[PDB]
Every structure is written in structure tokens, then in C-alpha cells.
């Protein structure tokens, strides 16, 4: 039961389901202490059973319990765990992650197969902890906290921060992801090339694997952090290392529309 | 009484409790029929149940009565002014002891919490809870700056004497977690209250000199 930025209170449906069970339980105790007739006691016990049922699995038996003033059923314990919006599929089998970005993709014809074009402003946020360490290592900032204040305001960013960023990413790779990820080639590791602009440059030969075109598509960006994650991405997930199809064994990074036409 | 926060069966059971109370107090000598006297207790039990169980955040019965009266007054004024009354009109109609500020505070008191699972958008895949940040747990950035400051303060306290560092760490709660006092600090060391104050002040002056000559600790403030 949390207080929102505007001072209003937001609460979960479980509190309402718990209150109903507690209210009915307390009332039954009072009725039993009063020696109420069996008809009243039977109604209270039947309501107590239904209140427990709604708490555990709302709507499974009978009409769903709704919050007065609306017809939206209250979300019970079973609803929390089940379904496409439940705990399993929404929070355990997949998650939202840090060190991730997104932008529109354009074609980079000058790139090598293992390279991508990463915008500088995306890379600045994606590699921020590494950049702060490099800023402190150099004389750009006195400490990590001073360096972080420098990056907060756009007009406070100096031209040596971009030189430091170029050093941070040297040799590292990033993961480029396009939805839907139909097969494992929907994620590939590239060595970023910091570029001016706001769109990600994608190598032409990997568009078929991503099923990507340049009509407005977008991709996500992920930064593996440890040495193990960087080693796996550079060895196993690098685009230049996955040239054949895992499904049929035929080339999957190969000449395409304009390349075929010219040759 | 349906549609006021309690379900139909909940109203019946609360009413049944008033009916049980009515049988206890009903007096047949008066020659009044049972329903005339029982209807008072049945209604009273139902109404008290609504005042006590209709809201997630319970508002006392007296405050519930004030809220109901304020709603009635606004509704009557609204149908007479041909518009929504302002707090000044409502306060004037409520009577003595009421002003626009009190009318507004009472209305702020009577705001029910919103559900964290209310859908947003035509397709039900987004909810209010998905947009509310958690501001209790420290963030990774906040945790690191706290640990960085502790490391720097530890190094700065190294330049102090063996006992001067203990005095500052004891007085500022850097050891046991809670601040100690001059007398309590003296109890550990066996010195009088006045001397502890001076030695701590000299150490604090020492640290100030070190910080000025390094300026390695001002950024954390």
C-alpha cells in the first residue's frame, strides 16, 4: 500500500481479499458467541468458505469478486502465478534488464561483418559505470561522484569524455536484438563503432538472419558485463562466427538483393 | 443499502446482528409490533457496518458522518447553483467551524486508494504497478557512494592519532552504530567530560586541515 508521487495511495487486490476474509471470520466469531440460530451460522460459514476461495482462486467457482464501483475481478493468488501475465512467464522466464538501450536501425555498408554502428549518446549511458572509472583514471574528474555530476548536464560534457569512451569500449562487444526472436540468430554480438546520430547502423549481410529491413525497424542493445559474458559473446555469439544456418547448415550470411544484382 | 461498499450478503449478516440485538431489548408490554422496534436495530447495524468496513483505509464513524454530510451539502448546492460549488460555498453551507481549507482537507481525507492492478490501454497487458518506482531500497548508485565515502573517511581518520580516531568514531556513531556522549565516551576511557570535548575538537580541526590540503572529501557532501 504505497503513496504515489501525487500523495495518492495505491494498493494491491490481495489486501481487499484479505480484508473480506478477516471481516467474515470476525463476524462469525461474534455470531457464535451470541448463540445465533443455525440458519445465520450456516450463511456465515458459507460466506467464509467463499471468501477463502476468492483469496486463493477468484472466479474459479461462482461469480468473481470485484471491487465495488467497478466490474474488474480482483487479482487472487492463482492469477498472480498463472497466465502470460503471471509470475512465471512475466518475471521469471523473462525480465527487464539494466545496461540496455534501443533505437532505429539504418544500414551501414562500410561496416565489417563483426561491426555495428552504436550512437555515442547511447554508448555513453550504456557504458556509464565504465566511463566514470576511466574519467577518474584520467584527469577529467577527481572522483566517480564528480564524474557523474558532469554527465548529468549535457552542456557540462567535455570533449575528453568522448576520448575516454572510445577507450572504454575498445575490444568489447554488444548484443543486438530484434523482436520477434524466432531463432538464435535474432541476437548477435558486434563490436560497436561510436557514431554521430541517434540510429544504430546494421551490417547488410546480417539483415536476413534478423529478418530486418530499414522501413522503421528497431533493435535493442545489451551490454555483457563480466569477462565470462564478454568471452562468450565474442567467441560464440559474434556475427562473424555464425555464418551457417543451425537449421539446415547452409550459409545464412550471404549476398543479398543489391549485392547479387551487382555481381 | 446495496452499492455502498458492502455486498448484499454482507449487509444481511450485519443486519442479522441488529435483529439479534433487537430481540434482546424488545419489550412486548408496550404493545408495539416487533417490526416497528426491530427496524431501528437492523438499519443501525447495517449502517455501522458500512462505516466500519466499506473502505480499505478505515475512517472513524464520526469522520464518515462528516464526509456524508459534506457530500449532501455539495449535491444540494450543485443542483441549486447549476454548477459544482466551490469550497467557499460548501464551507458556508456546512455551518460554523467550517472554512474552505477544512472542506478541502476533508475531501483529501476521503480519497480511496487506487488498485495496483488497474489496466491501462485497450489491451490488458499494462497496469499501474508497472509505472510506480520503488524508492525505499537504495539504488546501486546510492549504495556505492555510501561505501566510497566510508572508505575515504576511513583513510582520512588514519592521519589522526590512535585515541583521537576512536573519540570521533565513538562520538559520531562510527563504531557501535549509535552516537555516544562525552560522559559515556569518558566512561570507556576514564577521562572527564570537558577533556573529551577539547580532544575531539582538535582532531576535527586536524581533519579540516588535511581536507583543505587534499580536497579529496568535499565532493561527497
Amino acid at each position: 500500500m504505497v503513496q504515489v508521487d501525487g500523495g495518492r495511495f495505491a494498493t494491491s487486490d490481495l489486501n481487499d481479499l484479505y480484508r473480506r476474509l478477516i471481516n467474515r471470520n470476525n463476524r462469525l466469531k461474534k455470531l457464535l458467541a451470541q448463540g445465533a440460530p443455525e440458519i445465520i451460522i450456516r450463511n456465515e460459514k458459507r460466506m467464509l468458505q467463499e471468501a477463502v476461495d476468492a483469496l486463493l482462486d477468484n472466479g474459479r467457482r461462482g461469480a468473481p469478486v470485484t471491487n465495488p464501483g467497478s466490474d474488474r475481478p480482483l487479482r487472487s493468488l492463482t492469477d498472480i502465478l498463472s497466465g502470460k501475465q503471471g509470475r512465471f512467464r512475466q518475471n521469471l522466464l523473462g525480465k527487464r534488464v539494466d545496461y540496455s538501450g534501443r533505437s532505429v536501425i539504418v544500414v551501414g555498408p562500410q561496416l565489417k561483418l563483426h561491426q555495428c554502428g552504436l550512437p555515442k549518446r547511447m554508448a555513453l549511458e550504456l557504458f556509464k559505470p565504465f566511463l566514470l572509472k576511466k574519467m577518474e583514471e584520467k584527469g577529467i574528474a577527481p572522483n566517480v561522484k564528480a564524474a557523474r555530476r558532469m554527465l548529468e548536464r549535457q552542456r557540462d560534457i567535455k570533449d575528453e569524455v568522448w576520448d575516454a569512451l572510445e577507450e572504454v569500449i575498445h575490444g568489447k562487444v554488444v548484443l543486438l536484438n530484434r523482436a520477434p526472436t524466432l531463432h538464435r540468430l535474432g541476437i548477435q554480438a558486434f563490436q560497436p563503432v561510436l557514431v554521430e546520430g541517434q540510429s544504430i547502423q546494421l551490417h547488410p549481410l546480417v539483415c536476413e538472419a534478423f529478418n530486418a529491413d530499414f522501413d522503421g525497424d528497431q533493435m535493442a542493445v545489451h551490454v555483457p558485463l563480466s569477462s565470462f559474458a564478454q568471452a562468450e559473446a565474442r567467441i560464440q555469439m559474434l556475427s562473424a562466427h555464425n555464418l551457417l544456418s543451425p537449421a539446415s547448415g547452409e550459409p545464412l550470411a550471404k549476398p543479398s538483393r543489391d549485392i547479387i544484382l551487382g555481381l | 443499502y446495496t452499492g455502498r461498499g458492502l455486498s448484499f450478503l454482507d449487509l444481511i449478516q450485519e443486519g442479522n446482528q441488529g435483529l439479534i440485538r433487537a430481540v434482546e431489548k424488545f419489550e412486548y408490554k408496550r404493545r408495539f409490533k416487533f417490526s416497528t422496534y426491530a427496524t431501528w436495530w437492523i438499519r443501525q447495524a447495517i449502517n455501522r457496518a458500512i462505516a466500519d468496513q466499506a473502505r480499505t483505509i478505515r475512517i472513524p464513524v464520526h469522520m464518515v458522518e462528516t464526509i456524508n454530510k459534506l457530500s449532501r451539502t455539495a449535491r444540494q448546492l450543485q443542483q441549486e447553483l447549476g454548477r459544482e460549488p466551490t469550497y467557499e460555498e460548501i464551507a458556508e453551507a456546512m455551518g460554523p467551524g467550517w472554512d474552505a481549507k477544512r472542506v478541502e482537507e476533508t475531501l483529501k481525507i476521503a480519497q480511496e486508494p487506487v488498485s495496483l492492478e488497474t489496466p491501462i490501454g485497450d489491451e490488458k497487458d499494462s497496469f499501474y504497478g508497472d509505472f510506480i518506482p520503488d524508492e525505499h531500497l537504495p539504488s546501486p548508485v546510492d549504495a556505492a557512494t555510501q561505501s566510497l565515502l566510508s572508505e575515504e573517511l576511513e583513510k582520512a581518520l588514519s592521519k589522526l592519532s590512535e585515541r583521537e580516531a576512536m573519540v570521533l568514531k565513538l562520538r559520531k556513531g562510527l563504531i557501535d552504530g549509535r552516537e555516544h556522549t562525552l560522559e559515556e565516551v569518558g566512561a570507556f576511557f576514564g577521562v572527564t567530560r570537558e577533556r573529551i570535548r577539547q580532544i575531539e575538537n582538535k582532531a576535527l580541526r586536524k581533519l579540516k586541515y588535511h581536507e583543505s590540503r587534499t580536497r579529496k572529501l568535499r565532493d561527497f557532501l
Binding site: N43, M47, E50, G62 | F8, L9
Partner: peptide, 15 residues
């Protein structure tokens, strides 16, 4: 009605 708590209660009090 077995499915409807209200109908079941009304039937019982009508006895």
C-alpha cells in the same frame, strides 16, 4: 440455487 449464494439463502429463510 447451488451456484447462487443469495438464492440459496432466500430459500432457507423462506422455510
Amino acid at each position: 440455487s447451488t451456484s447462487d449464494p443469495v438464492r440459496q439463502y432466500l430459500h432457507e429463510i423462506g422455510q
